[PDB]
Amino acid sequence: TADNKFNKEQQNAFYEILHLPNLNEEQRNGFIQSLKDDPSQSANLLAEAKKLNDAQAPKA
Secondary structure: OOOOOOOOOOHHHHHHHOOOOOOOHHHHHHHHHHHHHOOOOHHHHHHHHHHHHHOOOOOO
């Protein structure tokens, strides 16, 4: 890149965020929808998403 700053584990994770089998997209599409249509808070979104993962992922 040369203008914005999409690298802090954002781009890479994004492709992954779209795989979490334990969540619906209403919420997911929410954070990321901004990541694609608005590369602004996309980074902070990354953080919040990973969190919303466990909040609904099975466990022991």
